[PDB]
Design a protein around this ligand. Structure first.
Ligand SMILES: CNC(=O)c1cc(Oc2ccc(NC(=O)Nc3ccc(Cl)c(C(F)(F)F)c3)cc2)ccn1
Length: 298
């Protein structure tokens, strides 16, 4: 499951630490961090490139180092896709810290970004040049579904799909990622204490109750991600304490109301992703086809 059998090809991925100029932090948890860096010649010969470097911080143990190595292997296993954050290289040599180097995405995470554009949105479109529109939102949804369809094809599951784990790069390209240990999950209100600190508002009933993670529970989370996108970055389940009674109502069939910027069809898609039976939710392949059609109709 963590790719401990498949090897690391150093000649392909290894990047020298002394060609990496580390800069300002991009995100910090308790044990992990992401740092902005300039990398000389990491992918194009003798060309300086801005990159994002995931690494441990002081306080990390070897257990987190093992987790970071497994993350490097998972990214190598998954391979390249436009809508998955692109692995560029790694620093794995002894005598320095493990570093996982990925592409830098200009606009950061999608939640924060959308939350800043409420005053820069029109449903259908020079004064409006940098505005989001309904087309951008369906387009972002489409791209995340394509990315997840790809992940499913590599026999992977995300386990933490949410707008905070989507990056927005140039030209309206979104990329799925996992900040993981580079997010302070104690101080982040999206992760609630259960037994573990877990993203309960994004989790399917079977995951909350039976600790079952499959690609179909990722579909549930994708539905919540849609809600985040068509609320322009609102926090899910507004006005609700996330306690025992929330978990019961969810099981009983309670669901979020339509968000402010949704279409009727998009809301029905959120409801489809939140079907109580995992097998009756759409697949990511069906989500791709469906969102592609909605993009046409738009
Ligand atoms: C302003 N710009 C930034 O702040 C910024 C910050 C970045 O920080 C990041 C750096 C590295 C990562 N690492 C992953 O994502 N690891 C990963 C592990 C398992 C799995 Cl399954 C996946 C997958 F496949 F889901 F994608 C991805 C995540 C975010 C990157 C770009 N830009």
């Amino acid at each position: 499951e963590h790719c401990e059998r498949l090897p690391y090809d150093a000649s392909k991925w290894e990047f020298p630490r002394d060609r990496l100029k580390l800069g300002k932090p991009l995100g910090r948890g308790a044990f992990g961090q992401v740092i902005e860096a300039d990398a000389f010649g990491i992918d194009k010969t003798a060309t300086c490139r801005t990159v994002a470097v995931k690494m441990l911080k002081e306080g990390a143990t070897h257990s987190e180092h093992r987790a970071l190595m497994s993350e490097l292997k998972i990214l190598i296993h998954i391979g390249h896709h436009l809508n998955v954050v692109n692995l560029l290289g790694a620093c794995t040599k002894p005598g320095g810290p493990l570093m996982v180097i990925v592409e830098f995405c200009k606009f950061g995470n999608l939640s924060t970004y959308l939350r800043s554009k409420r005053n820069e949105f029109v449903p259908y479109k020079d004064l409006y040049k940098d505005f989001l529109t309904l087309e951008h939102l369906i387009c972002y949804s489409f791209q995340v579904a394509k990315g997840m369809e790809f992940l499913a094809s590599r026999k992977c599951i995300h386990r933490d799909l949410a707008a905070r784990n989507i990056l927005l790069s140039e030209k309206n390209v979104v990329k799925i990622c996992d900040f993981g240990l580079a997010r302070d999950i104690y101080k982040d209100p999206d992760y609630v204490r259960k037994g573990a600190r877990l993203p309960l508002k994004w989790m399917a009933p079977e995951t909350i109750f039976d600790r079952v993670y499959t690609i179909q529970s990722d579909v549930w989370s994708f539905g919540v991600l849609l809600w985040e996108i068509f609320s322009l970055g609102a926090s899910p389940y507004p006005g609700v304490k996330i306690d025992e009674e929330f978990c019961r109502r969810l099981k009983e069939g309670t669901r979020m109301r339509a968000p402010d910027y949704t279409t009727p069809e998009m809301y029905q898609t959120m409801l489809d992703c939140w079907h109580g039976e995992p097998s009756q939710r759409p697949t990511f392949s069906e989500l791709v086809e469906h969102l592609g059609n909605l993009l046409q109709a738009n």
